[PDB]
Amino acid sequence: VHLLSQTHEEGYSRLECKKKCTLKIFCKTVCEDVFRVAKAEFRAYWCVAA
Amino acid sequence: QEDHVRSSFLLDNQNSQNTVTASAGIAFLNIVNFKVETDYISQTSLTKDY
Ligand SMILES: OC[C@H]1O[C@H](O[C@H]2[C@H](O)[C@@H](O)[C@H](OCCCCCCC3CCCCC3)O[C@@H]2CO)[C@H](O)[C@@H](O)[C@@H]1O
Numbered sequence: 135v136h137l138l139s140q141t142h143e144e145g146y147s148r149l150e151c152k153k154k155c156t157l158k159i160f161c162k163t164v165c166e167d168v169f170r171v172a173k174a175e176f177r178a179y180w181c182v183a184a
Numbered sequence: 185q186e187d188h189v190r191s192s193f194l195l196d197n198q199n200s201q202n203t204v205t206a207s208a209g210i211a212f213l214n215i216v217n218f219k220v221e222t223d224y225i226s227q228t229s230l231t232k233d234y
Contacts, residue, residue: 162228
């Protein structure tokens with residue numbers, strides 16, 4: 135039984151490091167943080183006796 | 185009485201430095217003089233403790 139579906143948003147800063155190689159000889163690891171507003175829809179149900 | 189102490193320490197560190205300097209100067213006999221020098225530095229550090 136569909137109880138309720140709602141969407142939830144939250145801002146999070148994800149830090150990630152990547153190894154960029156330009157010209158296959160200039161290789162450096164750059165760490166960057168991205169602030170993203172992650173949004174997810176949750177749909178909660180419940181089981182009733184048929 | 186029993187005591188157990190366990191300590192683990194990990195340190196990691198990386199430094200990457202690249203330097204490029206490209207110069208080009210053409211000089212005719214006191215008619216045209218053209219000099220172009222480009223520089224590039226890239227210094228990155230990354231330390232991770234635990
Ligand atoms: O910083 C900005 C945000 O800070 C909080 O939210 C924090 C949250 O309380 C925390 O748990 C996590 O930060 C830490 C980031 C965790 C994910 C990356 C972890 C990395 C660590 C290094 C190795 C790779 C993974 O998310 C956000 C950060 O925006 C609040 O939502 C609010 O103040 C604001 O919106």
